[PDB]
Amino acid sequence: HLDTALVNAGRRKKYTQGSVNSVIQRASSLVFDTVEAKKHATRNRAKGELFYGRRGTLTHFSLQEAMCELEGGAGCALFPCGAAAVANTILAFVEQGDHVLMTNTAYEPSQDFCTKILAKLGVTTGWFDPLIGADIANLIQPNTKVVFLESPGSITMEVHDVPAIVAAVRRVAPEAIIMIDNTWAAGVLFKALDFGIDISIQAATKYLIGHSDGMIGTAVANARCWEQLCENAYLMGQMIDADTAYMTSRGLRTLGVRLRQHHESSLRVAEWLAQHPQVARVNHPALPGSKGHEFWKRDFSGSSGLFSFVLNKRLTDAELAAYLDNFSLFSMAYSWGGFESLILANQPEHIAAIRPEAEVDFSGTLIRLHIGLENVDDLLADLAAGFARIV
Amino acid sequence: HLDTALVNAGRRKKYTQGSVNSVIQRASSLVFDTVEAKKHATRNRAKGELFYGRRGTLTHFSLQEAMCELEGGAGCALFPCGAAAVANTILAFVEQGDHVLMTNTAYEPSQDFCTKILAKLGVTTGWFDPLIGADIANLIQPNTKVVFLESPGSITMEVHDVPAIVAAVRRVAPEAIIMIDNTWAAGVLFKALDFGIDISIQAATKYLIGHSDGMIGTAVANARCWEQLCENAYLMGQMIDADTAYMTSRGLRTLGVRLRQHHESSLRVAEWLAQHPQVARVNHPALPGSKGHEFWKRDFSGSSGLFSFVLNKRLTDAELAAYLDNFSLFSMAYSWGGFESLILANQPEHIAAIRPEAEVDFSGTLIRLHIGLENVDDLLADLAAGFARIV
Amino acid sequence: HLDTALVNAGRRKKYTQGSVNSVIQRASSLVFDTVEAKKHATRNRAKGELFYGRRGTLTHFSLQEAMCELEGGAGCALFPCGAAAVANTILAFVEQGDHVLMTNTAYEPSQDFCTKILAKLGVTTGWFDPLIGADIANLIQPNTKVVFLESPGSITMEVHDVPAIVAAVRRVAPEAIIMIDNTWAAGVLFKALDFGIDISIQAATKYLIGHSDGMIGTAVANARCWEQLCENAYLMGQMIDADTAYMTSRGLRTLGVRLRQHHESSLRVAEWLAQHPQVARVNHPALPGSKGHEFWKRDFSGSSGLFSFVLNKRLTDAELAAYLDNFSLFSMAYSWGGFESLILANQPEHIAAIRPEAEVDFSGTLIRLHIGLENVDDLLADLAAGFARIV
Amino acid sequence: HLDTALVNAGRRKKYTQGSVNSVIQRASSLVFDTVEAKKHATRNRAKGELFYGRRGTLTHFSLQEAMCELEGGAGCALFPCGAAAVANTILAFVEQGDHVLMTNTAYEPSQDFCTKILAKLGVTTGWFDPLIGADIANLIQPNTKVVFLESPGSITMEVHDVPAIVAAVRRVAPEAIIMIDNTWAAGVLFKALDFGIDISIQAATKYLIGHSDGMIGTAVANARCWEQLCENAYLMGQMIDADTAYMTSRGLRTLGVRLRQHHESSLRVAEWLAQHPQVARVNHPALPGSKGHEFWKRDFSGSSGLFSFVLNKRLTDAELAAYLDNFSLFSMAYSWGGFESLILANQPEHIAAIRPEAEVDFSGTLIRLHIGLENVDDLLADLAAGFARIV
Ligand SMILES: Cc1ncc(COP(=O)(O)O)c(CNCC(=O)O)c1O
Ligand SMILES: Cc1ncc(COP(=O)(O)O)c(CNCC(=O)O)c1O
Ligand SMILES: Cc1ncc(COP(=O)(O)O)c(CNCC(=O)O)c1O
Numbered sequence A, B, C, D: 001h002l003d004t005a006l007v008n009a010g011r012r013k014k015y016t017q018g019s020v021n022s023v024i025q026r027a028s029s030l031v032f033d034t035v036e037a038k039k040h041a042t043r044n045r046a047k048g049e050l051f052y053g054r055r056g057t058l059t060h061f062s063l064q065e066a067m068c069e070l071e072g073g074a075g076c077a078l079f080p081c082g083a084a085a086v087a088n089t090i091l092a093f094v095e096q097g098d099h100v101l102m103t104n105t106a107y108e109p110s111q112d113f114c115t116k117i118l119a120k121l122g123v124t125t126g127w128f129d130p131l132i133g134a135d136i137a138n139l140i141q142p143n144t145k146v147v148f149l150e151s152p153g154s155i156t157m158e159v160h161d162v163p164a165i166v167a168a169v170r171r172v173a174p175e176a177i178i179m180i181d182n183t184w185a186a187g188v189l190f191k192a193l194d195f196g197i198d199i200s201i202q203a204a205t206k207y208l209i210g211h212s213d214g215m216i217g218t219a220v221a222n223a224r225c226w227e228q229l230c231e232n233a234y235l236m237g238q239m240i241d242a243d244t245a246y247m248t249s250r251g252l253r254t255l256g257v258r259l260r261q262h263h264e265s266s267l268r269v270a271e272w273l274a275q276h277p278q279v280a281r282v283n284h285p286a287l288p289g290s291k292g293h294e295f296w297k298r299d300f301s302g303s304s305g306l307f308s309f310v311l312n313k314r315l316t317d318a319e320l321a322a323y324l325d326n327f328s329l330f331s332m333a334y335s336w337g338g339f340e341s342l343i344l345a346n347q348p349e350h351i352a353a354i355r356p357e358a359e360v361d362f363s364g365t366l367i368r369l370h371i372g373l374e375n376v377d378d379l380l381a382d383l384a385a386g387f388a389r390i391v
């Protein structure tokens, strides 16, 4: 029933006022007809009554309701982008003297927030290998407050054993705040809260928006953590504009059909790459043999379209240009989750530099692909032409 | 020449591409045609080359250029709202052990960020009376890193003697970061950076947007402080959407003709209130006798339309409803800076509770007015009817 | 390669300027830097140079290029909605004394334009049964200027034999303008201009927008008819706003994946209805046995999700309310082509009244369904519950 | 009280739902909760009940209410631009055999609609000098259905004696439909429907939008003519998108303070030009001695900022480039009514060619200026520098 839920989540008449989609209510000022209405709005300023634009309008409330339904949460906080959701969700739960334990495959801006901002504020960060599983218990310190997961990992796509990690954390520090950056799954292919994670964070920028033309972050928390997340993020002034909230709700309505196509196409590309003589390794959560693939198969309900692979050699700078500059359909850009296919390259030492306290286990150039909605045979031909430029 | 500058600031062909206003470029992904173009964009990712949507698109670059011209700064950082600009601009310059010195008339959410977020990060906040002037030197501690001004003050409208404050800070701690919330002046009626302030922060939500239908914060920094502001705000994921950036640029184009009307009308209302038997005090920076009026007359080039007054009595709850619930033109809402007139009330003890380490010097109910663009005689008739309901 | 074409159509650097999607250029005024540039823009004011907002901005040019590529036309005119495209495209080619020959299954507002507007301007209109095929030749008068097709027909879904109609028209009246309302096919499941039709009109409101939140009409003409269409529509001031043009281009990027789901789901529902004891007839072009199905099978490349069926009785007012008022997933609304499922009822005598010079051949209430993106088993359960309410 | 009316027109709780401005309701489909509600909406589909997006959503209804209040009409029809409003408002009231009598100073596209569209549909058009006054009676034919006014005229700015024209029409042809293109007055500086005109048409593109970034037309009709205008324009599919309707309502809120500045600055420039040795004539309705000034003074409540003047020679193309290419503040573009100043040149023989059955009474190049919101002394200096380039 996920497709039905995606079509209907948040679409109630109090928000739509007769249209199919929520109205767009643009506001800072929200008007109180009487002193008693103002008092009521104040009491309910975080409970869906119109109070002030920084808390939201009908358009935001509709999106928040949709996200809570789809991710099974008590509340959804909104942010100007994914990086803001990560940074402010972590910040909401720490004080000076605390420790954060974060996967070494976390998105680089998330790491840099920890090492360049949190550290200044008296909050330390330690690191773990994404396949650590139950052994994470040994890394929990007396002051560990937050455990931060990201599955699959950024770039290299390792999938955590979330049940093993969560069980170990709860044994040692049942009160800890467990968070996950659930962007790759779009919050719906992995139902994080059902696994005992406290907060599921997404760059709604990616698959929820789905068209590469809006930026927005979300964080859906369970009942234990919601009030602290909501109020501390509000104290940092975190919000999103009404129009982007509308566009995120709108993206939900095609998320199912889109994801099924990204899954089908990216798996086909990954299977083809795995047979290719110029490819050393394919990092796709759905491909047999990929790191944590057995946890993806057990714990996820599908795949998206982002993955990576390692070439059979380290490209020279001349080869990198010959390869990347001459694609016809794949484009070079950051971000992903849109309708179009993207390609980027990283050398192994570049990845090692963003794997704290760890090395990488490959020596070829790594290529990250986002597989969009183009015909897959056309995408395969584009990749084949690229291989011919470097063979 | 301010009106000419407001019409033209940021409106260059590289952003407008033939239209009068900037194009609206909605993006996360920004495409690099070659590896070398990507390297160039990376080196210039904070210098106006398209790199990634979190840094901005053409639409943001146009607004940033306009704000730097109008406020005389080296760079302009963008935020989802004014409160995010205040919180993240302060956060960008502090670390555990630092001290912030803030006017006791600061906007309440700014105070709450200090007491409820900064405090648990090991950053202490002290307070000063807005008329302290040169005596602020005695409050500067070895660990004072930030001095935070707001002139006129929130609600009660006291105007600082900025030249005296800045000179005192520079004598004792010249490296300190002096910031101002310059929202009431819309950043243009008081040229903060020409007075030796380091960073001018605004809720562009107010007069820059001008229509009560968008939220956005700005912070314009001098060359000394720009890199740290830019990079630390970016690590917190702070940005605004392209469409709100467009609407802020658009608001600049009528800001001069709007502010002149708000000034003319609000001063007429303030002069009338000052003669009224039911009014104890009028707090309008432009009205003779108001706190810091001589600094407003010396240091500002105009007034906006927000001010307050104190009634000759403390209204009962029944009188508050009779007064506020029955206006025909003034509405109750938070925010201000739009085309319509607004009214709110506060009891003295409510204000005292947001004047840290200080008491208030009045006992009547305080009324805050925003004077919009309606005909002033109609607004006066509405206020007169209000007075008759409580006489 | 249609999916690749849909992802990339119109997305050239001159329109996108570095983002994935076109920029949104909002304009009436377009600025000429020199008199020489103004002269060049004037000469090329219908050839893709920026001249005046009524002709379009970069955003419109990008959509027009996409529509010409996808429908194989020489030019694409834009209109405020589908009905404006129909009315103004017909008007662009008639003058007093002319005759229009239109299918009797044409959309009712299209018929009303002919009988209420054209008739008082000296232009007569005659009618044909949608399955007339080659016998249309005997209805062509010496003054027949326009032959207007709609396949499938509105409401009742009959599919024309376009090859037989076009061949008959060209034998008798080679210079006639053959037009089609190609909305049901979204202009891509039936390539009208490859069949010898001169102009393909769409309510881009439906599947191109795809989300029920924008209105826009398009008309794509061959080289023979383009100049007259363009210039006469322009004389009537026909245009669309830049933002809706952007959203139409954006809809193209998911059109393929959406249509495949609408086809799969709607055919499954039709097959179930076609064996259902409370259903007298199913009108779905893709269902064997439906009127004109053999032509759909030969001439179309797929199906959308709009179709109708006839109940085993004419519902009374109490029965119609018990049926329609209590659906859980299907909603009552006009329009279609969006992500959500819709239901409407038409009584047979109502349809007969909008079948000029013709009778209907059924007596039960007709139900028109739009099958959206919800889970099809959930939709079937909703329809089954409906049947139980009227059994 | 106009400023108060402009701030408040159309801003009722049913449309704003708690915000200051209307909600933006984007919709084709509008959902009926029950068959009973659909029946009610159908009966009232042109009477302000939500029925279908082509009729409008809450956002349109709010704008329509505002326009009817401000112009004193029974209804307001919306169109994609001003030219569509003119063409479709005329078309709504003519049939084969009718005659249209139009001022020879009408906007050129309005003339071209008459000569190129209406003529081939059996509707003839004749012409009259804008100062004809009461002598227009002699030109009214038995089949004259529409008398079309435009005051001030396009380009040359002549002001009609509307009382004299209307009285003559009513004496000879009381049932005629009298229309005016009231764009220059923004519908509010000349209350056309109080002078016995039946329909006031505007390019809301100009001063109502006020920022050069939207296009929209309006036609406000009296009770006698509303139903025919509404229903015939709807049969042509004429509508505007919800977002442009919102931006038009939003423009009303600053229209008063904008127009006062355009009046002040443009009259100052006109007075300067009227004493300048390089100027042969100044065409500004507010300038004493301009054609029809005495009617402007009697019948209008203010002036906008668009006017023209005639140079002391017909400039060559080389002089036009030297003059126009090198302005610093004035830009070349079509349209007007925005915040920036614009300049265009018209040769006398080109104007004569769009003065049907009449000649011009000047031989110098005509310069049309739009005076924006820049500082007027800067604009005067820009014009002076232009004079020096051609002296
Ligand atoms: C896994 C993951 N988490 C957060 C972000 C940041 O979201 P944004 O809206 O961009 O602030 C991303 C961003 N990725 C860019 C890239 O991978 O190229 C992310 O992938
Ligand atoms: C002086 C001042 N500074 C910051 C803000 C916050 O801006 P926002 O965009 O709302 O986050 C304000 C806000 N004012 C609301 C009120 O005064 O009622 C402000 O006044
Ligand atoms: C087949 C077909 N052709 C034109 C239109 C009109 O488009 P719009 O954008 O609404 O002006 C439609 C519209 N139909 C409404 C309905 O079927 O309920 C159409 O179906």
Ligand SMILES: Cc1ncc(COP(=O)(O)O)c(CNCC(=O)O)c1O
Pocket (backbone or CB within 6 Å): C028, C054, C237, D081, D082, D083, D084, D086, D107, D154, D181, D183, D184, D202, D203, D204, D205, D215, D216, D217, D333, D334, D335, D336
């Ligand atoms: C007086 C007058 N009436 C109608 C229009 C057309 O409006 P639009 O929204 O542009 O279709 C205009 C147009 N003017 C362009 C120009 O004068 O340069 C007009 O002036």
